[PDB]
Symmetry: C3
Subunit: 607 residues, 3 copies
C-alpha cells in the first residue's frame, strides 16, 4: 500500500542480543610526551677560509741603457751598419752615493760583460754631471727617471764608418711578485731575479744558494731613501737590499718572511652563533647567515695549522670587539676562545657565552668547555650552499615536528576524555553507539558494565510498508508514538508484523505507546526521506532535501602543498665566466699563438 | 573469601560531596581568526646583471717588409755578414690609390726611420709593382696578402761583400681590441697603437694630451673598400680611419663611441613576476625561476646608472613582446615600467598588470604606482642561491602556517561545541565526568548549575571482598542489580560494609535494588578484570583480555620527519676549473718560471 | 528589588517551537583516502659531467748552439765586432746513433740554412767525442744536457779580425701542449712545431694534408730510449716520432689520437639511487647526495655521445664493484645498465635493482626496463644547487602533505562518530544543542526524529528581577527547585511573570516543583555571576570569578614558523676568484698589457 518514497536508504531489524557476543571499550591510551628541548649554547664565532696568498711587494731598479751605433755615410744619405744595445747595472756605490743622496747620476757605465770589463762614455763628452728627470708621461705606469733623452750618433764624416755612444741612466719603480717564495721573484717584464725579498740575514735556506763572498748582494741597514721627485727624505729607516744582476741592479726593502704570507682569511663574523650538540657532532648555526656547520666535538689544533698567526690575532680582535658592543653588560664570557674545523673546511672560532642570570652555572660550564681543548693547509669548498641548505632544512623540520607533535598529543588526550562521554552515551542508546563502534548495524544491550551485541539483518527497501493509522481501535484513548510497518526479508513470501524504530529499525514488537494528544505531528525517518504523520494519521512522505540542514561537524579546510619544479638557474655559465674576462683565455690564446705566423716568415725553403 | 583475581586495578570510595568544594566549567574561548590574505600584484619583470665587457673591432694593416742582407763570398761557401729587417708604413696615398683601388702594390718603400728618410727598392730592378696575392694557408688565421715570396741576395762575387735588398708588401686583416676607450688599442704584436676609433670631436677625448702632428692621422669619408680577394667593391660607404705609425699603417672604420660600449646585461625574462609588499620592502617572486628578490619600496634611478641605455631598450622590448603574447586580451597594463634594485645587485624592471575584471580599480592603482617613481656601476653577486632559498623557504612556510592555523581554529571551535555535550553528560554521571575533569577520582553532585565535588579515598586492592549472593533473604522477590562487597582502608583491622559501583567504586550504602528476574547475567568491573555473576549468583572471575575490545577513539598515525645531512657537494673543485684554464700544471709550471734564470747567463765570469 | 549583580550576561526567553521551523542534522560525510604510495625502484647510478680536456704530452728536443764571434784586437783591449748565434737541428741519424745509443754527441753541426748547407766545427781543432752532461741546476727545470760549457773567441792577433766558432749540443725534455687534436702543438719553450703525436697513424688524418719530402719526418718503430742520466735502457719499446725543424729536432712518443682526448668525466657514484616515475619524467634522488634529477623517460643514446668510451668503462666498473660490496647477497640486478640525460646536463647511468624477496616479479620488471632502451658534446651546468633544492623541497613537501592528510581524515572520521553523541545529546536538552548548532539561542523540541526550532527574544539585563522566596505559601510542603523572576522586554512598561531556567532562560511557565528538603543549597546561573540561594531562600549573589574553574577542553599550543631572511652569502665571489692567484690575474693583465707603453721607445721624432 504505502511504500517508501525514497528507495535509497536501507532497513534493518535488530533482534535482542544474547550472551553470545559481548565486547568492551578500549581504555585510554598512554600519551606521547614532548621531547626534551634542545639546549643551545650562546657564543660568538668567526669563520675562516683558505686563501691564495700571493707575494707582492715594491722594488726599484737602476740600470743604464748603453747603446753604440755604427753609421756609414753615403754621398747623399747615411745608413746604420748596426746598433748595439745593452743594459748595465748601476753600481752599489753609485746608487747610494750618486743617485740616492745627490739624485745626480753619472754618464758613464762600467760593467763586466762577457767576462770583459767594458766601459761606455756618454756623448763622448767630458764626464759631466747629469740631472735626472722623470720619464715622459704614460698611462698606468710606475715612476721612472732618465738622464738622457737623445741618442748620440757619430758626427758626419763622409765615406767613413764611425761609432757613437749613448748612455741613458734609467731608474724605475717595480712591482714584484713571487709565485713561489723562492729563489726567483719577477720583474715587470717577467724578467726574473734570483733573490728573495724575504732574506734576511738568517735563514736555513741561507745556505741554499750561497757559496759566497758578498759579492753581488749587499744590504744596507738604516737606509733612508729620498724621493727623487719630491726630493723628500724618508722619515724612517729601512733595511735596503740591493741585488746587482748583470743586466741591472734592483733594490727593495727587506722584511721577515713569515709574517708576510700568511694563508688563512677571516671570512665573516657572527655576532650570535649557536652551538648545538647532536649526533656526536656540533652544530653551529648563524641565524643571520642562515648557515649551519657541522664539526667534530674535539677542537682543532691551531698548531697544526701552518702560517696562521693571523687567525688568533683576528679572532680575538673580533671577539673582544663584539663582546663589548652587544655583550658587555649583558653577558659574561665562558672560557677562552676555541677553534673547530667544520666540513667545507671552514675553521670556526667559538667563544661560548653565559648570561648573567645563569651565572651560577658558570663553574660547571667552564670545566666542560676546557676539556674540549686538545703543519698542514686547510682546503675550503667554494660552495657554502650545503650549509645553508642544512640551516634551512633543520629549522623547517624543527617547526614541523614540534607543531605536529603537539597536535598528536592533543589528539590523544582528546580521545581519552571523549571516551567518558561515549560511555554514558551508549547507555542511552546502545544500538546507535554499538553500531557506530562496530561500524556495522548491530543490536546491543548492556549486561552490567559489559555490553552484549548481536548483528542485524538487512531488509529490502522494497519490502517495507507503513500502516496508515497509528491510533489503536482496540484500546482507544491511547496512541502509539511511532508508526507500525510490515515487511519481509525475501521477496516471495510471508509478511511480518513489526513497527518502525529510529534509523529505519524495524522492531518486531510494538510495545511503546503514549497517551493520545492533539496537534500531534511528527516526522519519522523512513527510507531515504521522512514519513509525515499528522494527528496520528498518515499524511505524505518527504525527502531529506526538503528540510533544511544544520551540521554538527566543525569544518576543516586542508589543502595540499602543490609540487614545484626548480629549473637550472645560473647568473653565470661556466662559459660565460671564461668569456667574461679578460676577455677570453681562448680568444687571447688564439691570438697569441698566431703571432709568429703573421708577423714573421719562417716559411721559405728553396731547393 | 572471594578476593579479586586481578590485582592491578585500584578501588575507590566516594563520599557524597558537600558545600565545601565546588567548581565551574570553563566557558568557550575566543577563536583565532585567519589572517588577511596577502595581496599580490601581477606584473612582468626583466632582470639585469652587471657586465664589464671590453671592446673589439676589425682592422686592416698595411706595412712592408724591408730587408737588406750582407754576404761575404768564401771560396767554397758563402756567409751572411748580417741581415737587416725593417717594417715600413705604407703611405696613405699609396694605400688608397695603389692598393685599394688597383689592388696593386709597389716594390719600393719610402719612409722615415731614425729621423732619416730611407728608401728601399725591391729586388733592385727598374721599378715594377706587380700585384698582391693571398698569403699561404694557415689554420686559424686572418686574411693577408703579400707581393713577394722570395728573398733576394746579391749575386756572388768572390772575395767581396755585397748588399741586397728585398721588399715584400704585406697587408693583413685581423682583430683589434680596446678594453675601454683609453688610450691605445692593441695590435697583434703586443705592440700597441694609440689612435681611437672612438673619437670624435664630439667627445672629451680630443682634449687628452696631444702631440700633435697633423699628418699622421687621416680620415676618409665616403670610403668604399674593395675586397682584395673577390675584388668586389663595397656597396656602402664607410668612414675610414687610417693611422700611420712608423712601423705600419692601420685602418679601420670609425664608429661613434657611445653606442658601442655599454654595460649591464639582461639576465632573464619572467612572464609572471609577483610583487609583494611586506616589511617595508618589496618581494618579487618568479614562480618558474623560483627566486624571490627583496627590494626597497623606492624605485632606482636609471639616470644614476652609467652606460645603460640598453636596459630601457631591452626592457620595453621584452615587456611589449611578452604582453602581447600572454597578456594581450587578458590583461591591461598599469602605469609605465618601473625599476628596482634588489639585493644581489640585480636590477629589476617591473610592469604592473591589472586584470580586465578588476579594471574599475585602475584609477586608484595607477596613482599608487606612479608615486614610486622618484653615474655608478652596479655590482652583482655570482650566487643567486640565496634568493632561491628565500623563494623556497617562504613558500613552504606559507603553506605550513596556513594549514596549521586552520587546524588550530578547527580545534578551538570543536572544543567549544563539545562543551555542550559535556554539560549534559556530567548531569548523567557527575562522578565520571568530574573525575575526568579533575584528573583524579572524585565524587560530585550537582547543586544547581554548579557542581560540588569531594575527593575520594583509595582502597587497597587486597582489602576488598565480594559477597557471594546478590539475592536478599530478608525481602525475597527483590534482587540487587549490583554486587555487594566488604573492604577496609588499612590492613590490620576493621571490615566495612559496602557495595560495588561503576569503575570500582565502593559505595557505602546499598540502596539500589531491582526486581528479580531470570536469565539475569551480568558483568561487573571488578579489579583488573570483570566479576561474573549468573542468575544473581557468583560464578567466576575474568580478566579484560578475555573479552574482545572495540575502540571509541579515532586513530591518528603521525610520524616525524627524520633528520637529513647535506654533505658538501660540488660539480667542480676550484683546482679543476683552474686546470681547465689551460694548462696544467706542475712540471710545466716548474719549467716555465725557470726560463729567465737559465737562459740568462749565470754561469761564471772571467776576470 | 533584587537585580542582577552582574550586568554583562544577557537573558533570553524561549517560546515553545511550533511546526513552522524544523531542521535536520547533516549526515556523515565521505572521507578522503590516503593516496596510493609512490613506488620507488632501487638501483645504482653513476653521474657524469662534461670535461675540458686539454692535450699535453712529453717531448724531447735536440738542437745545437752554433755561435761565431768576431773580435778586433785593440792595443790594450779587445772588442767584439759581432756575434752570430744559430740553432742547428741534430740529425735523425745522429740522434739515434750517436746520442741515443752512445749518449755521445759530435762537435760539428751540419745543417741547411738560408738554402745553403753550412757547417760548423767546435773548437776548430778537429773532432774529439764529447760526453753529454746534465745542465746546471736551476729550480723548477725540466732535464737537459749539454756538451760545451764555454764559448770561444779567437786567439789574439793584434790589428786583425778573427772568427771563432763554438758548438754546444743541447738536449732538453721540454713539455709539449696542443690546443687542437691536430697538428699544431707548442713547446714549453713555446716555439711552434707543425707535427703531432695525435693521429693514430692509420686514421682519417692521412687525407688531411701537409705535403713534404719524407726526410723531415721520420718514425722509428720499436724504439727503445735510454735515459741519459741513468743510462738505463727502456724496458719497453715505443714508437718514436722525430720531426726535424730547421731550428731543432723534436721527438716524442706517438699515440693514437682518439683515446687521448676524450670527454665526459665520472662525477660521482651513488650506492643507493632511487628512480621515481612521475609527471612523465623520471626522478633520481640520491639520499646521501641529497640531489634529485629529472630526466625524460626515454634513454639517452650513448652512440650519440662523442668520445665517451670511458663512460661505459667506468660505469660498469663502479656498478660491478658496488653491487658486490653492498648488494651481493642482498639484491639481484635487473636488466643491464641504462643511461639517461638529466637537466643540468648530467648523464646518469642507472642499474635497476630487485630484492630477493620480490624476485618473483623479476620477469615483469625486466620487460619494462628493456623497453626503455632506444656525435655531440653535452654541456653541464656549474651549479648543482637546483637539484639539491628539488631534493630538499620534495622531501619536506612529501612529509607535510602526508602527515597533514592523515590528520584531515582523522578529523573527518572523528566528526562522523561525534554525530552519534550529539544525536542523543540533543534529546536530553534540545535547547542547548539547538542553540549551539544554530549558533544563536533558540528553542526547539523534538517532533519525531526531526527537531522543530524557534528563535528566542533577548531580554534586557536591566529588566530582570529575582523573587526572594522559592517556597510556595499556597501549597506548603513543596518547594520549587529553581528561582522565579520577573522581567519585561522593553523599559517602560509592563512586568511579566516568569522563572529562571538554565543559562539565563526565562521560562514563562513556572511548572517545575520538587519536594521540599533541608540543606537545600544551590547555585543558579544568574546574569554574569551566580545567584546563591540557601534553604529555599535568597542569600547573596556571586560572580563567576569567585568560583574556581575547570576546563573541558584539551589545550593545543600552536605557534607560527617565523619569517627568516637570507642575505647574500658567498665564500667565493667572482672578483676574489679572479684575484686569487699570485700575484694575481687582474693585476697581471693590467701590468702586462702596459708593458709596451712604458718601455717602448718612440721616443720622439725629429728631423
Amino acid at each position: 500500500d504505502i511504500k517508501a518514497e525514497n528507495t535509497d536508504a536501507n532497513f534493518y531489524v535488530c533482534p535482542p542480543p544474547t550472551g553470545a557476543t559481548v565486547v568492551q571499550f578500549e581504555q585510554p591510551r598512554r600519551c606521547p610526551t614532548r621531547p626534551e628541548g634542545q639546549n643551545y649554547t650562546e657564543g660568538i664565532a668567526v669563520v675562516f677560509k683558505e686563501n691564495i696568498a700571493p707575494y707582492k711587494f715594491k722594488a726599484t731598479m737602476y740600470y743604464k741603457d748603453v747603446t753604440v751605433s755604427q753609421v756609414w755615410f753615403g754621398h747623399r744619405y747615411s745608413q746604420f751598419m748596426g746598433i748595439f744595445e745593452d743594459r748595465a747595472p748601476v753600481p752599489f756605490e753609485e746608487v747610494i752615493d750618486k743617485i740616492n743622496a745627490k739624485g745626480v747620476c753619472r754618464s758613464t757605465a762600467k760593467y763586466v760583460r762577457n767576462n770583459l770589463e767594458t766601459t761606455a762614455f756618454h756623448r763622448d763628452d767630458h764626464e759631466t754631471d747629469m740631472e735626472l728627470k722623470p720619464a715622459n708621461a704614460a698611462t698606468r705606469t710606475s715612476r721612472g727617471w732618465h738622464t738622457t733623452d737623445l741618442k748620440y750618433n757619430p758626427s758626419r764624416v763622409e765615406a767613413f764608418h764611425r761609432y757613437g755612444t749613448t748612455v741613458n741612466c734609467i731608474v724605475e719603480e717595480v712591482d714584484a711578485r713571487s709565485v713561489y717564495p723562492y729563489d726567483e721573484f719577477v720583474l715587470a717584464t717577467g724578467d726574473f731575479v734570483y733573490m728573495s725579498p724575504f732574506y734576511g740575514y738568517r735563514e736555513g735556506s741561507h745556505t741554499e744558494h750561497t757559496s759566497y763572498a758578498a759579492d753581488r748582494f749587499k744590504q744596507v741597514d738604516g737606509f733612508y731613501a729620498r724621493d727623487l721627485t719630491t726630493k723628500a727624505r724618508a722619515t724612517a729607516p729601512t733595511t735596503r737590499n740591493l741585488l746587482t744582476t748583470p743586466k741591472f741592479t734592483v733594490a727593495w726593502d727587506w722584511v721577515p718572511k713569515r709574517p708576510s704570507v700568511c694563508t688563512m682569511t677571516k671570512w665573516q663574523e657572527v655576532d650570535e652563533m649557536l652551538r648545538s650538540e647532536y649526533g656526536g657532532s656540533f652544530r653551529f648555526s648563524s641565524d643571520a647567515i642562515s648557515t649551519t656547520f657541522t664539526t667534530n666535538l674535539t677542537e682543532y689544533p691551531l698548531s697544526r695549522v701552518d702560517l696562521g698567526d693571523c687567525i688568533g690575532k683576528d679572532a680575538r680582535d673580533a671577539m673582544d670587539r663584539i663582546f663589548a658592543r652587544r655583550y658587555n653588560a649583558t653577558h659574561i664570557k665562558v672560557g677562552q676562545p676555541q677553534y673547530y674545523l667544520a666540513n667545507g673546511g671552514f675553521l670556526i672560532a667559538y667563544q661560548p657565552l653565559l648570561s648573567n642570570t645563569l651565572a651560577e652555572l658558570y663553574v660547571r660550564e667552564h670545566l666542560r668547555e676546557q676539556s674540549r681543548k686538545p703543519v698542514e693547509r686547510i682546503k675550503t669548498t667554494s660552495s657554502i650552499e650545503f650549509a645553508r641548505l642544512q640551516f634551512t632544512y633543520n629549522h623547517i623540520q624543527r617547526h614541523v615536528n614540534d607543531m605536529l607533535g603537539r597536535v598528536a598529543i592533543a589528539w590523544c588526550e582528546l580521545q581519552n576524555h571523549e571516551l567518558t562521554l561515549w560511555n554514558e552515551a551508549r547507555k542511552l542508546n546502545p544500538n546507535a553507539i554499538a553500531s557506530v563502534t562496530v561500524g556495522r548495524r548491530v543490536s546491543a544491550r548492556m549486561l552490567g558494565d559489559v555490553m552484549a551485541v548481536s548483528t542485524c539483518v538487512p531488509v529490502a527497501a522494497d519490502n517495507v510498508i507503513v500502516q496508515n493509522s497509528m491510533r489503536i481501535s482496540s484500546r482507544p484513548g491511547a496512541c502509539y508514538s511511532r508508526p507500525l510497518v510490515s515487511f519481509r526479508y525475501e521477496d516471495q513470501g510471508p509478511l511480518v508484523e513489526g513497527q518502525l524504530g529510529e534509523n529505519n529499525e524495524l522492531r518486531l514488537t510494538r510495545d511503546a505507546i503514549e497517551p493520545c494528544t492533539v496537534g500531534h505531528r511528527r516526522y519519522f525517518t523512513f527510507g531515504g526521506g521522512y514519513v509525515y504523520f499528522e494527528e496520528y494519521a498518515y499524511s505524505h512522505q518527504l525527502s531529506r532535501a526538503d528540510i533544511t540542514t544544520v551540521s554538527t561537524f566543525i569544518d576543516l579546510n586542508i589543502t595540499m602543498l602543490e609540487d614545484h619544479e626548480f629549473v637550472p638557474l645560473e647568473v653565470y655559465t661556466r662559459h660565460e665566466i671564461k668569456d667574461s674576462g679578460l676577455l677570453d683565455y681562448t680568444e687571447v690564446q688564439r691570438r697569441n699563438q698566431l703571432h709568429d705566423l703573421r708577423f714573421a716568415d719562417i716559411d721559405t725553403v728553396i731547393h
